[PDB]
Amino acid sequence: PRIITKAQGVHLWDSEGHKILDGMAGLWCVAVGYGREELVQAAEKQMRELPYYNLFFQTAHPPALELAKAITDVAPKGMTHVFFTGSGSEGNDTVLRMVRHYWALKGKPHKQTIIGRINGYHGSTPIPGIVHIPQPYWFGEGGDMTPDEFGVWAAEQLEKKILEVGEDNVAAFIAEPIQGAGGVIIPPETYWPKVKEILARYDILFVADEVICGFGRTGEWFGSDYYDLKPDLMTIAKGLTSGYIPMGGVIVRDTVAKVISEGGDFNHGFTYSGHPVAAAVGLENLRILRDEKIVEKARTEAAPYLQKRLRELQDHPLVGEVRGLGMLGAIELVKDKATRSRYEGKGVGMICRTFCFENGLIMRAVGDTMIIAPPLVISHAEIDELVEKARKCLDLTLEAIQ
Amino acid sequence: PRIITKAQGVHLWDSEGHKILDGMAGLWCVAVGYGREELVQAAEKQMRELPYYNLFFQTAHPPALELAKAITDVAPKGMTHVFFTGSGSEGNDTVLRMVRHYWALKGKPHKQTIIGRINGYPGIVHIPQPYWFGEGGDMTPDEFGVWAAEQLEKKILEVGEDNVAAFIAEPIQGAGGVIIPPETYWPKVKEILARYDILFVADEVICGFGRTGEWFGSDYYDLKPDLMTIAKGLTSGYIPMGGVIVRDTVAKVISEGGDFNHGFTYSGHPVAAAVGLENLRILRDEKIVEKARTEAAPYLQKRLRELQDHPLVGEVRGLGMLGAIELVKDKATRSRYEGKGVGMICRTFCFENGLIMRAVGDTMIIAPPLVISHAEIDELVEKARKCLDLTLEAIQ
C-alpha cells in the first residue's frame, strides 16, 4: 500500500522515499505544480479576514471581481463576463441553461438541441435534445484517409447535423478544443478552420469547453486562443486555481451577457460571483501564471522540448504514434504500426499504466492511449525524467506481452 | 457597501472600528462563527501536503473518506452514503438525477415528476407551503397544517403515483423567511408518504449541521428521508462544498444492480473535506450542536419573543437557532404595510446599527452562528428593538 507524504513541483514522494513524477498535473489541474506557498497564503488570508459574504458588507479588494477582471484580460477578445461555479461540471450544466435561456429571451424557444461530439458529450441526464457528430480522432476512426481530409469530413458532419436537426431547433454546438479525457484527441489541421467556416453561416451559439485546455495547457491561455476560435461561452475550472481549491465558471461573450441581463436579469443573479476564498486563490494562481511568465515559458521553452523529446518514443516497437501540442501529449500502443491495430482485448494501456505506477511516473491510460498533461512548470531535467521512465515502461509493457 | 476588516465569533468590524453582529451566520452557513483558526489550518495543511487527487496514490488518511464517515455518523440511521459536490445547488441537481436514475433501474422510468412546495425547489409540480402566518387566513395553525399536508396526497394522485419520482422539501424553508410548519404538518406528510411508492428528499442545505438544534431538520421533525442535500454549514462556509447523503437501500440501487453513476469523481475536493472534517470534529467534540440545543437555543427563543410587545411585530416564531419576526400594520388581521417595503427599512436600520438580520419581504429572520453566547443574544434582541423602534418611527 503506497502512501504519499510530500509533493513538490512535478514530484510526489511515497513513504518509501520513492520519487514520482506526476505527468497528469494532479488531474489536469495542478498548473503551477505542487507546494506553491503563495496560494496557501492567499487562501489563509481570506479565510480569516472574511471567509464568505459579499454585497452590503465586503472586503477592501473583493477577490471575486479582481479574479474575473483577471480572467477577462487573458480571455479571447469579446469575453467580458465571468459567472463562477463550485466546479467545472457545474460550469457545463450552467452553460446548458444559459444557451437555452439565451435563445428564449431572443424569442426563439424552439432553439434547444445541443450538438456534441462522440466522446465529449458530458452528463445531462441520448437525451431528446443532445445530438452527437463524430469525433476528429484520425488515429482510430479515420481509417486510411489523410489527416487533413478526415478532418474536413468530421467538420462537415457538423453542417449536415445542423441542417438535419434544423437551424431553428439548434441552440448550440459545444466542444473541447482538444478532447483530452477521451485520450487527447488532437484534431487534424483542417478541422477547426472548417468548423469556424460552418459556424459562421448558422445562427447557433458556440461553447468551448476549456475545462482542460484552459490556463496554459495548450501553450496559449486557452485552446480557443490556440485554434483561434471565437466562442460565445467558455467553461473553465481546474487550472483556474491549479486545483488547490474547488472552483469553476463560465466566461461569456459581451453580446450574450447583455442578453441574459437586459430583457431578464431574473436568472442573472447579479454575479454573486463565487466563494471569496476560492477566488483569492484563483487570483494569485493567475497572477503567478502571467507575472512569472509560466504560460509564456510553457509555450516557448517547456512545450517545444517536451514535444520533441516525447516523439523520440516513436522508435519503440509498441508505439503506433506520438502526438501532442503545448503541454499535451499522447502515445498510441499498437500491435502493428502499419494498420494501427490494437492488442484486441489484452488491455495493454492498463499494463503500461501499471508499470508507470511501479516506476514513479503518472501517465493516464485511455484504453490503449497513454496521455500526459504535466504541470506547466516542468523543467528540461524533468522532461528527461519523464520520457526516460516512459521508455522503461514501454519496454516493460512489451516484454510483459510475451 | 461598508468595508469589513476583520471577523470573529459572531462579530464583524468595519474600517471605522464599529462592531457588527452577523445574525445570519454569513449566509446561513458560518456555524462555528468566524476566525476559527483550526479550519484555516486544516485547509492550509492539505493544500501543501496534497491539494488534489492523482490517479495512483493518496495520503495516509484521505479527508474525503474521514469526512463522509463523520457525516454518516451524525446522519439519520440508514443514511450510509455521501456523494460530495462543489456546492449546495449542485447537490440539488445531483439528487434530481439520482431519484430519476434510481427509478429507471427499478424498471419504472415513467417515475420522473418531482413534487416541490411553493417557495422552495410537467417535470416539477408544486403544492402550497405551510406558511400559516401569511397563507392560512383564519384557520388554526394545526388544521391549516393538516390541509397543507393533505395537498401533497391530492397532487400525488392527480399526477399519478407511476409518474411521481419524489417529494422534496426543506424541513423548514430557510430562504423564504423561516417558514416553520404547524405541529401537525410533518406527522401528516409522513403518514401520506408511507402510503405511496415515492422517494423523499430532505433539503438540509440550511437545516443541516445544527441549525435546528439537532444535527438535521430530519432529526428534529423525525423524518425518514431517502436522500438529503447538504452544503454551507458542512464547512461553516469557510470553503465551498456540498453533497448528498443517501439511504442505504437507494445507494445499493444506484451502485450495483445498476453500476453507472458513482465512479467518476464525486469524492470531493481534499482541501474542502479537510476543512469540513475539522468543522464537524469541532461541532461534535466541543458540543456546539448540543449546546445550541440545550443552552443557546432556549434563551435565544425566549429573548427574541420579548419583541412581540413591539407595535410593529405581528409574531415572533422560531426553533433551534432559527427565528423570525413578522412586521405588520395590524396584528389582529396580520395585514402588512402594503407596498411600503418595510423589511427594507428595517434591514437598513439593522445595517446602520451593527446587526445583520435578513429581510424576506416583511419577515425579518435570523440564523446566527451556533456558538452565539447569552451576552451576544442580549446584543441581538437589544439592537433588534432599537431598529424596530427606528423602523416604526420612520413609517411616520
Author numbering:
A (entry chain B): 34 to 158, 176 to 452
B (entry chain A): 34 to 154, 179 to 453
What does the paper say about this structure?
Omega transaminases (ω-TAs) can mediate the chiral amination of several unnatural substrates without the requirement of an α-COOH group and are highly relevant in the production of several pharmaceutical intermediates of commercial interest. In this work, we successfully overexpressed and characterized the two recombinant transaminases TA_2799 and TA_5182 from P. putida KT2440 and solved their crystal structures. The overall structural fold of the TA_5182 and TA_2799 enzymes is similar to that observed for other class III fold type I TAs with two α/β domains. There are two highly flexible loops present in the structures of TA_2799 and TA_5182 that mediate the entry and exit of the cofactor and the substrate/byproduct into the active site of the enzyme, leading to significant conformational changes in the enzyme structure.
We determined the structure of TA_5182 in both relaxed (open) and closed states, mimicking the cofactor-free and the cofactor-bound form of the enzyme, respectively. The open state of TA_5182 is not easily observed. It shows a distinct conformation in the overall ternary structure of the enzyme, which allows the cofactor molecule and the substrates to enter the enzyme’s active site via movement of the flexible loops. In the crystal structure of the open state of TA_5182, these residues could not be built due to poor electron density in this region and hence were excluded from the final refined model. In the crystal structure of the open state of TA_5182, the “lid” loop could not be visualized due to the inherent flexibility of this region. In our crystal structure of the apo state of TA_5182, the electron density of the roof loop is visible. Comparing the open state of TA_5182 with the deposited structures in PDB resulted in an average RMSD of 2.0 Å, which is expected as the conformation of this state is significantly different than the PLP-bound state of the enzyme. The major conformational differences can be found in the roof loop and the outer loop in the open state of TA_5182. In the apo-open state, the F321 in TA_5182 is initially positioned near the surface of the enzyme, widening the substrate entry channel of the enzyme. Y322 is initially in a hydrogen bond with T127.
